[PDB]
């Protein structure tokens, strides 16, 4: 209505973001975003990573993003079907079966996909 | 001027997109999420019937937003709720690695790896 993003979402440049208040494994986080007619967070570059991190106050909290390990292809792939195409995220940890990517205020971590953490959904105001 | 994005079909209070390509169920969910949309949710027999009327080819199956949860041993929607109903009259087995699809006439359990078309929705 009034603002570009709906109630409870936060605008950050060309995206509306929803930071969850509950926890889920990665696959349930994806389901949640879909239910809310949104995507798990896709991070275009380092600059976007840093601006998103600058919204987070609590330095200890992890959030799933829309990237996980494809075992058959042995690399990180976004839910839009693309391979990770740069090192802008400086992922910390192992690239192995049943791993998924999370972010905190300061870092980006590989975590087992069964781990129960918060998640970030996006709606694009100006898609590519 | 109409209620839905270009290529989406209005049905009652939803906009639906019927894929033309195929995918296993997990990729289908990822596709809908990428399109800022949900895999199809069906509330009851009347919404099933009306959606099925949009499918004009008898062979073709379409994934919806319903699969078999292994931990819970029951059918669960992607919105978190259990099916907890027999309205859809599911044909086939309720077992690990099974997902739900729809045809023009029926509702089928299929292996989640099966590559078929899928239906995404946006609520009006
Ligand atoms: C998928 O998202 C990633 C991260 O934003 C981006 O690098 C990539 O180009 C996108 N792929 C497509 C097909 O849009
Ligand atoms: C990785 O994400 C893709 C969707 O892009 C999906 O095919 C699969 O469920 C995910 N794998 C795991 C182990 O979470
Ligand atoms: C999940 O969607 C299904 C099918 O439309 C419906 O039965 C159920 O009420 C939904 N759950 C919630 C909380 O809306
Ligand atoms: C079933 O869907 C749920 C999301 O609601 C997800 O936890 C899981 O990835 C799916 N399982 C299979 C085998 O596709």
Residue numbers in the entry:
A (entry chain B): 90 to 217
B (entry chain A): 91 to 214
Text of the article:
The asymmetric unit of NKR-P1_glyco contains two monomers, whereas the asymmetric unit of NKR-P1_deglyco contains eight NKR-P1 monomers. All these monomers are arranged into very similar homodimers, with pairwise RMSD on Cα atoms up to 0.5 Å. The dimerization interface of the NKR-P1 homodimer consists of six protein–protein and several water-mediated hydrogen bonds, a peptide bond interaction via delocalized electrons (Lys126-Glu127), and a small hydrophobic core comprising Leu119, Ala120, and Ile168 from both chains. Glycosylation at Asn169 is visible in the electron density maps of both NKR-P1_glyco and _deglyco structures. In NKR-P1_deglyco, a single GlcNAc unit remaining at Asn169 can be well-identified in all eight NKR-P1 chains. Interestingly, the localized first GlcNAc units linked at Asn116 in NKR-P1_glyco and the overlapping GlcNAc units at Asn116 and Asn157 remaining in NKR-P1_deglyco participate in dimerization contacts with residues of helices α1 and regions β2, L1, and β2’ of the opposite subunit of the NKR-P1 homodimer. In NKR-P1_deglyco, density at the homodimer interface can accommodate the remaining GlcNAc unit of either Asn116 of one chain or Asn157 of the opposing chain of the NKR-P1 dimer (for details). Conversely, in NKR-P1_glyco, the first GlcNAc unit at Asn116 is well defined in electron density in both chains, A and B, of the NKR-P1 dimer, while no electron density was found for glycosylation at Asn157. This suggests that although the glycosylation on either Asn116 or Asn157 can contribute to the dimer formation, dimerization might be impaired by steric hindrance if both N-glycans are present simultaneously. However, the structure of the NKR-P1 homodimer shows that Ile168 is found at the dimerization interface rather than at the membrane-distal interaction interface – more specifically, in a small hydrophobic pocket within the dimerization interface.
Signaling by the human C-type lectin-like receptor, natural killer (NK) cell inhibitory receptor NKR-P1, has a critical role in many immune-related diseases and cancer. Human NKR-P1 and LLT1 are type II transmembrane glycoproteins with similar protein topology: an N-terminal cytoplasmic signaling tail, a transmembrane helix, a flexible stalk region, and a C-terminal C-type lectin-like domain (CTLD). In addition, NKR-P1 promotes transendothelial migration to immunologically privileged niches upon interaction with its endogenous ligand, lectin-like transcript 1 (LLT1). Here we report the crystal structures of the NKR-P1 and NKR-P1:LLT1 complexes, which provides evidence that NKR-P1 forms homodimers in an unexpected arrangement to enable LLT1 binding in two modes, bridging two LLT1 molecules.
